[PDB]
From a paper:
Given that the addition of the extended hydrophobic groups did not improve the affinity, we investigated the possibility of adding polar groups that can participate in hydrogen bonds. In each case we preserved the original length of the main chain of the n-butyl group (four atoms). At a pH of ∼5.5 the carboxyl group may be partially protonated and act as a hydrogen-bond donor. The electron-density maps indicate the presence of two side-chain rotamers. The second rotamer is in a similar position to the hydroxyl group in the 3-hydroxypropyl Arg8 meditope.
In this report, we investigate the possibility of increasing the affinity of this interaction by reaching through to the other side of the Fab hole. Our recent efforts to characterize and optimize the affinity of the meditope–Fab complex focused on the importance of cyclization and side-chain modifications. We wondered whether it was possible to reach through the other side of the Fab hole by extending the side chain of Arg8, increasing the surface area to improve the affinity of the meditope–Fab interaction.
Numbering used by the authors:
A (entry chain E): 2 to 11
B (entry chain B): 1 to 220
C (entry chain A): 1 to 212
The structure:
């Protein structure tokens, strides 16, 4: 799932 | 070189409309199509549409009615406008360009625009120092930082000494507090013997609220 | 639309090892597939186009193969800067679609955190709120416990943690734990303690201070 804060999949 | 620079991040009220401007350089809009892609938690990467060299547009099927892309060739600007945003439209929005004028292999991307869809209000952060001390020094290395508290929406940019200090810097991902405001720290480790000689300043820029603060961080 | 399925969700490898990313398509798409790298806080960077063709400025260690429904992005010898998410894109069928991505994590040797503690600033106290920050710097692996104690009372539920993405240079993580109080509560107590547990430490490390 993509995380807008880090721009990474978490 | 080839560059795409998008407008700043911001908050958009639910049911309201989103506007982003993609300003290009290093090529001409009359020769290349410009594509729009977004990246959400729900759907990941998702191609939205394109405006071609000659001004024609295609819109991905789910967006034909709420999406318009326009441009000004002489100004090298492409304008994205989406209507009736719901909260799951919260995403990073990119403009992109392919290698060849008709293709879709996106070799050049904008920096992205984080758009938050929420009913709340924009609020700038307060910046507090994380002062170096003996409790933050080991083997001639001191840790120090800035606490960037109570802002909305994401993102906030943090740098040190106006860009000249980058090594040993950790800026933590923001966390949402019960208040619905975000908070983060940015830290950096330096040689402790430089504390008496060098100034340390975190530069905080919260674009959505147009708040820029430089916080000098000193031993106490 | 074509569904692209990337497997697995997460890869964990050691530097120098070869690594492979899989992309499967819901029907044949020939060789119409592109691959991208997304680094922490970055935009997608194009790695390979049309299954196997190279891109200007992309290190040679990157390559791709496949046709039909089954495709592979390879790194022949992983470096720490390869820490990223990887996405495939098909464009045989309109509209162009992307896979959900695979995360590349790097292993390294255990590294114990350096632990620093920061009292609330006088500046913050004027606002009537107190933040006590405990920093765990450059450690591996990611798992760690932080236990707050105020005058020996165990704290629970009044702290938040943030962990950085993996470091592109040394493959470590850093963690912050922030204990939040009112000014009034903070002034009522003396000893603020942050206890850290991690695989790299032979015993829990405690950093603390006395208010004033």
């Amino acid at each position: 799932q993509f995380d807008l804060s880090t721009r990474r999949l978490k | 070189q080839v560059q795409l620079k998008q407008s700043g991040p911001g908050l958009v009220q639910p049911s309201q409309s989103l506007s982003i401007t993609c300003t290009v350089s290093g090529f001409s809009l009359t020769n290349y199509g410009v594509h729009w892609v977004r990246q959400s938690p729900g759907k990941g990467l998702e191609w939205l549409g394109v405006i071609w060299s000659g001004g024609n547009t295609d819109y991905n099927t789910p967006f034909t009615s709420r999406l318009s892309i326009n441009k000004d060739n002489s100004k090298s600007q492409v304008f994205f406008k989406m209507n009736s945003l719901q909260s799951n439209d919260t995403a990073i929005y990119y403009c992109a360009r392919a290698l060849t004028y008709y293709d879709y292999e996106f070799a050049y991307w904008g920096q992205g625009t984080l758009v938050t869809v929420s009913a709340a209000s924009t609020k700038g952060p307060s910046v507090f120092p994380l002062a170096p001390s003996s409790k933050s020094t080991s083997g001639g290395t001191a840790a120090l930082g800035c606490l960037v508290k109570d802002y909305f929406p994401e993102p906030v940019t943090v740098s040190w000494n106006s860009g000249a200090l980058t090594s040993g810097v950790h800026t933590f991902p923001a966390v949402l507090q019960s208040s619905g405001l975000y908070s983060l720290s940015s830290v950096v480790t330096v040689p402790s013997s430089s504390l008496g000689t060098q100034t340390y300043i975190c530069n905080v820029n919260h674009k959505p609220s147009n708040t820029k603060v430089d916080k000098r961080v000193e031993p106490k | 639309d074509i569904l692209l399925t990337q497997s697995p969700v997460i890869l964990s490898v050691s530097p120098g090892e070869r690594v492979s990313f899989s992309c499967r398509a819901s029907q044949s798409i020939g060789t119409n597939i592109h691959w991208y790298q997304q680094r922490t806080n970055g935009s997608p960077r194009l790695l390979i186009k049309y299954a196997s063709e190279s891109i200007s400025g992309i290190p040679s260690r990157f390559s791709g193969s496949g046709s039909g429904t089954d495709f592979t992005l390879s790194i022949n010898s992983v470096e720490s800067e390869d820490i990223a998410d990887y996405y495939c894109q098909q464009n045989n069928n309109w509209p162009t679609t992307f896979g959900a991505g695979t995360k590349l994590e790097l292993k390294r040797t255990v590294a114990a955190p350096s632990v620093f503690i920061f009292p609330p600033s006088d500046e913050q106290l004027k606002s009537g709120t107190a933040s006590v920050v405990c920093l765990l710097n450059n450690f591996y692996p990611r798992e760690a416990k932080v236990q707050w104690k105020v005058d020996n009372a165990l704290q629970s539920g009044n702290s938040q943690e943030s962990v950085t993405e993996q470091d592109s240079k040394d493959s470590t993580y850093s963690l912050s734990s922030t204990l939040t109080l009112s000014k009034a509560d903070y002034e009522k107590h003396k000893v603020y303690a942050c206890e850290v547990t991690h695989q790299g430490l032979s015993s829990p490390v405690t950093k603390s201070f006395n208010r004033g």
